[PDB]
C-alpha cells in the first residue's frame, strides 16, 4: 500500500489529521491540504474520511 | 348499451417503451391505433378505462 501527506507530516488517509467533522470545524482545510496533493492514490479515502466523516451524530 | 362497463375492468399489459427506454407491464398499455378517417383524426384503444370510476 501507499499513504497521504500534509505539510511537515506523512500519515494514513482514512481518518483526518485535524479532529473529526474537520470540514464543519475548519472548512478552509483543503486550502492547506490540496495544493499539489491531488496526485496521492489515497486521496479518495482522505476525501471520504474528511466529508462523509462518520461524525459523532452517526453510529456503527 | 352504455352500462356494459360494469361487467369489465382495466388491465396491465406489456408495453414496448414506458419512457426511460425500457419495456414494462403498464396500466396505459396501447393496443391498436386506427386511422381510417380521412380527416386525419385517430381512434386509439388503451388498457385503461376512461369516463367511469
Amino acid at each position: 500500500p501507499v499513504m497521504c501527506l500534509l505539510a511537515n507530516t506523512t500519515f494514513p488517509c482514512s481518518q483526518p489529521p485535524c479532529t473529526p467533522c474537520c470540514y464543519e470545524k475548519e472548512p478552509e482545510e483543503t486550502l492547506r491540504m490540496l495544493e499539489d496533493n491531488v496526485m496521492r492514490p489515497g486521496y479518495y479515502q482522505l476525501l471520504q474520511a474528511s466529508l462523509t466523516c462518520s461524525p459523532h451524530r452517526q453510529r456503527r | 348499451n352504455f352500462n356494459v362497463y360494469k361487467a369489465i375492468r382495466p388491465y396491465l399489459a406489456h408495453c414496448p417503451d414506458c419512457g426511460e427506454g425500457h419495456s414494462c407491464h403498464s396500466p396505459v398499455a396501447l393496443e391498436r391505433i386506427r386511422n381510417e378517417a380521412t380527416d386525419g383524426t385517430l381512434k386509439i384503444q388503451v388498457s385503461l378505462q376512461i369516463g367511469i370510476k
Partner: antibody, heavy 127, light 107 residues
Framework: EVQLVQSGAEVKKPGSSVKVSCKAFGGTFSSYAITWVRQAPGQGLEWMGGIIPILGTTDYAQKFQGRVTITADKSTSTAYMELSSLRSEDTAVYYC????????????????????WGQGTTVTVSS | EIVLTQSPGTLSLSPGERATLSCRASQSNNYLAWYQQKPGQAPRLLIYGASIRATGIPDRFSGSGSGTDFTLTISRLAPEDFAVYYCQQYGSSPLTFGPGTKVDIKR
C-alpha cells in the same frame, strides 16, 4: 452509518389511526429516502404494498390503499407514517430503518457509498 | 416485470468455511442488494450487485454477479449465521423482493 430510531411497539383495534414514527441522524437532516418496509408475523419478506421512498410526496407501491389506507411524511430527520382504518392482518413488524430504494423506471436515482439499516417495531391489531 | 428468484430453496452447513447464495432475473441495470435476517430480528445489508460493491461491515461476507445472476458468500460462518436472506430492486410497476433463501449452522 446513519443512526436509525423508531417509536415503541403498540396494541390496536380495527377501524382507527396508527401514528408510527422514525428518526434518522448524522447527516440525513433531509431523509436519505428511508422507507416503511413491513413484514407479517413469521412470513418471508412479502413487503409494504404501501409506502416506497418519501420526502416530498407520500409515494406508495402498486398495491395498498385498495384494502387499507396508508401515508408517510418528510420532516427534518423525522419520517412519520400513518396507517388508518386498518384490520387484524395489518399486524406486522415495520422496518422504516432502511437504505435508499432507488425507483428504477419513472423519475430519479440514488447512492452506494454508505450502508444504512436498523431495528423494527410492532403494532398488535388484536381482540 | 420479472420477480427475483433465489437459487437455493434450503441449505445447511457446519461452523467454518463457505456459503454461496444466488439470485436471478432476466435483467439488472439498477442495483439489487443482499440482506440477512436472523430469526425474530430485523435485516441488515451485506452487499450491492449490478456493477459495484458496498458493505456495512468488514469483509468476511462478500459477493458478485454475472449476466442474469447475482450472488452472496460468507466466510468462516461459525457465528449466529442461522438466517434467511433476501434482495430487491424497488422501482416502477412491480419488481419486489426475492423469496427468502434460508441457511443454518448444523447442530
Amino acid at each position: 452509518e446513519v443512526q436509525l430510531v423508531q417509536s415503541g411497539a403498540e396494541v390496536k383495534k380495527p377501524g382507527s389511526s396508527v401514528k408510527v414514527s422514525c428518526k434518522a441522524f448524522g447527516g440525513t437532516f433531509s431523509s436519505y429516502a428511508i422507507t416503511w418496509v413491513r413484514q407479517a408475523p413469521g412470513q418471508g419478506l412479502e413487503w409494504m404494498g404501501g409506502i416506497i421512498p418519501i420526502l416530498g410526496t407520500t409515494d406508495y407501491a402498486q398495491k395498498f390503499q385498495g384494502r387499507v389506507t396508508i401515508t408517510a411524511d418528510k420532516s427534518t430527520s423525522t419520517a412519520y407514517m400513518e396507517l388508518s382504518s386498518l384490520r387484524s392482518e395489518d399486524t406486522a413488524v415495520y422496518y422504516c430503518a432502511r437504505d435508499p430504494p432507488t425507483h428504477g423506471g419513472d423519475f430519479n436515482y440514488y447512492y452506494y457509498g454508505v450502508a444504512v439499516w436498523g431495528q423494527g417495531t410492532t403494532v398488535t391489531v388484536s381482540s | 416485470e420479472i420477480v427475483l428468484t433465489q437459487s437455493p430453496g434450503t441449505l445447511s452447513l457446519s461452523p467454518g468455511e463457505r456459503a454461496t447464495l444466488s439470485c436471478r432475473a432476466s435483467q439488472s441495470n439498477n442495483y439489487l442488494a443482499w440482506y440477512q435476517q436472523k430469526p425474530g430480528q430485523a435485516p441488515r445489508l451485506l452487499i450491492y450487485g449490478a456493477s459495484i460493491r458496498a458493505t456495512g461491515i468488514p469483509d468476511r461476507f462478500s459477493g458478485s454477479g454475472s449476466g442474469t445472476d447475482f450472488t452472496l458468500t460468507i466466510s468462516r460462518l461459525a457465528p449466529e449465521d442461522f438466517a434467511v436472506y433476501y434482495c430487491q430492486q424497488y422501482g416502477s410497476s412491480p419488481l419486489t423482493f426475492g423469496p427468502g433463501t434460508k441457511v443454518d449452522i448444523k447442530r
